[PDB]
Amino acid sequence: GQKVHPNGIRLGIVKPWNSTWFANTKEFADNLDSDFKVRQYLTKELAKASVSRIVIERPAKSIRVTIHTARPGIVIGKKGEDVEKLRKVVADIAGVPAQINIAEVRKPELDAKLVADSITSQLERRVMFRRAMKRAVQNAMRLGAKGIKVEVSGRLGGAEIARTEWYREGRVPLHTLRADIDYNTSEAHTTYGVIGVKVWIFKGEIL
Amino acid sequence: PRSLKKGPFIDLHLLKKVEKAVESGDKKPLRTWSRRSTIFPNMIGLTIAVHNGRQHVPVFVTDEMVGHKLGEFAPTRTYRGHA
Amino acid sequence: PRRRVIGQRKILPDPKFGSELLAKFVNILMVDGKKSTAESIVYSALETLAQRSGKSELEAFEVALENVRPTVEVKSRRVGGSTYQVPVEVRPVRRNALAMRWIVEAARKRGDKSMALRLANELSDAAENKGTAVKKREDVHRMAEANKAFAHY
Amino acid sequence: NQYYGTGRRKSSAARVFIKPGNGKIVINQRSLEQYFGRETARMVVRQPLELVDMVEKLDLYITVKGGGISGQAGAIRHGITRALMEYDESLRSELRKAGFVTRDARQVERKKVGLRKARRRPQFSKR
Amino acid sequence: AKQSMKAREVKRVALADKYFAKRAELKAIISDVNASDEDRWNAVLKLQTLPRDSSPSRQRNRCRQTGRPHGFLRKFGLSRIKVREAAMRGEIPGLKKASW
Amino acid sequence: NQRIRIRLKAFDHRLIDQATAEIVETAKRTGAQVRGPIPLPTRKERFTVLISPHVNKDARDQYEIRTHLRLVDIVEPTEKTVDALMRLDLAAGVDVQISL
RNA sequence: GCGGCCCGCCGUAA
RNA sequence: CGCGAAGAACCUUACCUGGUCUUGACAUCCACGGAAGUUUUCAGAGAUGAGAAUGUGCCUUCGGGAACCGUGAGACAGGUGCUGCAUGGCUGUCGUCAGCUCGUGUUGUGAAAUGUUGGGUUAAGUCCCGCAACGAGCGCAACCCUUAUCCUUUGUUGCCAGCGGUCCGGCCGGGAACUCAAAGGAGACUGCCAGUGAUAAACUGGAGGAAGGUGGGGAUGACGUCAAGUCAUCAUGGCCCUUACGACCAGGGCUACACACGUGCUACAAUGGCGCAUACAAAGAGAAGCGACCUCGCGAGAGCAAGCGGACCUCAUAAAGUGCGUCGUAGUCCGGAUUGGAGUCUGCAACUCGACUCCAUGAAGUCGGAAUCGCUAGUAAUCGUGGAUCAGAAUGCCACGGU
Questions:
Q1: For residue B31, which phi and psi values (nearest 5 degrees)?
Q2: How close does chain E come to B75, measured CA to CA in Å?
């Protein structure tokens, strides 16, 4: 255990929060619990789509939720019926009335969460891990990025000690605070336990 | 000790039988689990068996022991020595 | 150290005499970081010594200091197997520091009531070339001159 | 008209007003020797004067707040030294050498995790 | 922890807040400086009669996520592990790393 | 009329500056005399948790949350001010209170 | 230029 | 080895004794009866059993959900059970040490080498010069937080130089100067001078400046090593229990005691003990909670009760220091352990097993063998204050100032 969490260390410099609201000591825990419940429900329900990031903001007597995704048509449906079912359930979870929004992901090969869970999904169908890693890295480099690093850990088929591999090219400086690094993880349950996946993407240094 | 503005603690379900065994004969020793009850003068001359965690051991109450707790007797830990 | 430390701390002079030696002496005698009691002790002892001597407040001090002051001492510098303690020469600041430390340490190992009386007594004895303080100087000189054979280095 | 200065120390701040009178060391509406316990504090407060214009043509209405004894005395000295700078501009050529111009910036350190103090760590008698 | 621990916790909370009203005046007349003998006696003999798992002191607050009995924080309601990971992720608004 | 006090608190400084600028501007538009946005010293609270799930008490982290305050104190509300405030009040993550 | 100071059970990552 | 545990009387609690249950204390299912209820009697250590009135109410679309209970069967639930040598995630350590590699090109039959070596420098694989090598990557440094100096903006609950009276309290009228408050800027870069140096890179001094040579202190931990630690936070692959290794209740234990180690607190005194009077901080906390003023108490506390969601009120009197008097080297008007009696308070409940108050008693101890560790400046040593966990409860932990 040696590396500081890349996202957390930059929360006040070049990175925003995901939940933004003000409260006092009385309702802090309740607000946190409600946000946890709604995020968990949304993640469970919208697994089939490509969900990347949930941002929760509390207006005065209200809750506002925005979802970032790469295939918005599936989430929003033929008409607004499915978003309305989601809004009903969310407003049930948290007492205040709720409103929903949809964001658009332009380049799904960035936004490390999508790359990570894509690799996990591939691993779930018994495909060689090395091909998946090389494919993802080549795609990300082709689409334009100054660097990328991926790694996988766990029982990769062999009963011997769980192994670890990683590839990297470009530039991924982790000790400079100005750098804009996107980082996320995932894990896949197989017949031989779980496998961990981590992704670093260096979009570009920010002045 | 208590504040003297609340009085001793009795654990009533013991009192309800100590009141009936005091007058209507019934010299059979009693079975109890309340080690946290005081000794009132009403109990004088009676025998009561108190749980110690494993099995209840009987004691014969006297007059000077009025004011103590039921658990002041019937020790719990068993020790003999290192030998 | 392996590197070199450059510089030296500066200390204010004594408030009522303007003597840095008095400041260093009271610093050495100071314990627990309580300067006021130490300077009270030093002032009481100095006035007592001046009364019992007939000199100024500083002449007795310098006389006592010069009575107990090292000139040479041994130091274990070694070549080729064994150690060969050899005598060396002492620079003046080290001499003053050693003198004051010996004075104070002799001061604390006596049974007279109050430190000020003790300190005055030992200062007077040093002025008269006697006491435990002078013994350290004498036996240091003795040990140094006993090894005056390896001093070629 | 009067002049002003400000001195600071470990946790002390000083407000200094200087006026051409003959002897006035009021501090918090109290005299100098009564305010300061008999110690080197009086020496240090009157120090930046005896070398230039030895407390003749001066009034020293002073206010102070925060810190302890030595901190307040040092802050007063710094403020008094600084106030004289806007009286004669040639006094720097001696106050600088005296060292009263520079502001001391030494204060306590944090208590760090795993240590009993700033730098004192628990006794290590592990085999 | 285990499911039964959480079930015991929620039942304890319910029983605690069900009988909250009467315990107040029971203790009030117990602690009264003008209370007589018999009424205070009946009160001390009657407060004992209530279900034992009804005092507020019989509750251990535990982490909402897991139920860990140690390392609780009243400000957030989570254990140290969960609050640390969530703070790193970005859930808690306003949290950072202090240096000073 | 009298003093009208607005207290503003938030976990970030940029949007608190934005909100106080907006509110002072709309109050000035409606027509009245207003005074400065007082800085009102901030509050900082720290936390310290240990990171290893099992042992090693000497591995810890420090976290903090800052809360900033601003005071407006609009005086002599001429007219349409109260309704303007009750209609022009928009902010995310900013808390606002008004006193008579 | 030379004072002294011995040992470490059996197998065992792919 | 003051480690998980940021807090053990019941609960927590996993452990022991005994009393109890079997689709279950917690979910999804299926079929009937059923607002959910609220009061209350008895047997019990209690779980739990018996009971009696209270109750049957919505949309009715006419049967369902709301509403939860009570039944019977079956899929099932439930395991702090074993394996950290099957794993993910998260930490310690070498070590904040300066190293660890790659692409192309050359050398060797090959494992490999070269670059990364050499001269001079630096805290540094930090930099110049040379050289079959020419360029890159992760590291170093910088970008982040705080502290030290000034300038603008704003001026209350914060401030008081000038003005006026004022009970002489910033108390009031006033002021916007100063402290301070929190936003925005300036500032240090070997910048300049002299010398040394391969006319480099740098290194010695000097000036100026609040600060001078990465100003001080943090946060940041490369490739890897130790089959290091954790299946009991959590998640998981394998096994293995299912009238029991699952579940409920009351008492007991985790606090035992011939002994042996680690980490701390208080002392053995005159640089001190006791009595009286006085003087200068910083940083935090507060609604099932901080709790003032008065009145009872020798005391811990009790009654009445203002203010405060807080630059306004409460916590909350800083202590070492400084002046007087005494004790006179004495196991002592040093030291306070143990024990008796009498109380307060929190809590259903202080026996095993809590914290404080009063009176009495007053132990070992006179500086510690062989051995052994912490610290380079506002640092060691010493003196006080706050916070979290929390009904109650720190000599521990994490923070703040004085000398």
A1: -110, 125
A2: 26
Domain parsing of chain B, residue ranges: 2-82
What are the φ and ψ backbone dihedral angles of A71, each rounded to 5 degrees? -130, 70
Q: How many helices (H) and strands (E) does chain F have?
A: 2, 5
Give the Cα separation of A88 and A80 in Å (integer).
12
**Domains, in order of start, for chain C:** 20-147 (1.10.455.10)
In the 8-state DSSP scheme, what is residue B12?
A: T
Partners of residue F58 in chain D, C-beta under 8 Å:
113-114
Q: Across chain C, which distance is largest between two alpha carbons, in Å? A: 57
Q: Which chains touch A (3 or more CB pairs under 8 A)?
A: E, F
| Residue from D102, D123, D120 nearest D110 by CA | D120
| β-pairing verdict for A51-57 and D59-65 | unpaired
Q: Is the CB of A161 under 7 A from strand G?
A: yes
d(CA A199, CA A151): 7
DSSP per position, chain C? --S--------PPPTTT--HHHHHHHHHH--TT-HHHHHHHHHHHHHHHHHHH-S-TTHHHHHHHHHS--SEEEEE---SSS--EEEEE--HHHHHHHHHHHHHHHHHS--SSSHHHHHHHHHHHHHTT-SHHHHHHHHHHHHHHHTTTSTT-
Any C CB within 8 A of D39 CB: yes
Q: How many CB pairs under 8 A join B and E?
A: 14
Q: Is residue C87 within 8 Å of C147, Cβ to Cβ? A: yes
Structure tokens at A186: 């995932």
Q: Does A59 touch chain F (CB under 8 A)?
A: yes
Residue A163 CB neighbour total at 10 angstroms: 12
Q: What is the DSSP letter of D108?
A: P
D94 is written with which tokens? 């001696």
Tell me the angle at which helices A81-93 and A28-45 cross, rounded to the nearest 10 degrees: 150
Question: Could you tell me if A80 lies within 8 Å of chain F, comparing CB atoms?
Answer: no
Cα(E4)–Cα(E13) distance, integer angstroms: 14
Whether A11 and E95 lie within 8 Å, measured CB to CB: yes
- CB–CB of F96/F86 below 8 Å? no
- Three-state DSSP state, A105: coil
In angstroms, the CA of B58 and the C1' of G6 are apart by 69
Question: Helix crossing, D40-50 with D69-85: angle to 10°?
Answer: 10
Which nucleotide is the nearest neighbour of F59, by CA and C1'? H91
Map out the domains of chain F as residue ranges: 3-100
User: What are the DSSP E strand ranges found in D26-103?
Assistant: 59-65
> What chain A residue is nearest to F94 in terms of C-alpha separation?
A22
- Alpha-carbon distance of A198 to A115, in angstroms, equals 9
Cα–Cα distance for residue pair E18/C21, rounded to 1 Å:
80
Please name the residue that has the structure tokens 């002599």. Answer: F76
Please tell me what resolution, in angstroms, this structure has: 2.6
Beta-carbon separation of E44 and B12 below 8 A: no
Task: Give the type of residue at C148.
Answer: K
Are C88 and C71 in contact by the 8 Å Cβ rule? The answer is no
The answer to whether F90 contacts chain E (CB < 8 Å) is no
In the sheet that holds D3-8, the strands lie side by side as D3-8, D13-19, D59-65
Q: Which amino acid is at B49?
A: A
| C81 CB neighbours strand G below 7 A | yes
Q: Which nucleotide is nearest to C82 (CA to C1')?
A: G3
**Interface touch A21/F10, C-beta < 8 Å:** no
* Phi, then psi, of C117 in degrees rounded to 5: -60, -45
Could you name the CATH architecture of F3-100? 2-Layer Sandwich (3.30)
Reading the block at residue D121, the tokens are 């760590």
- One-letter amino acid of B36: R
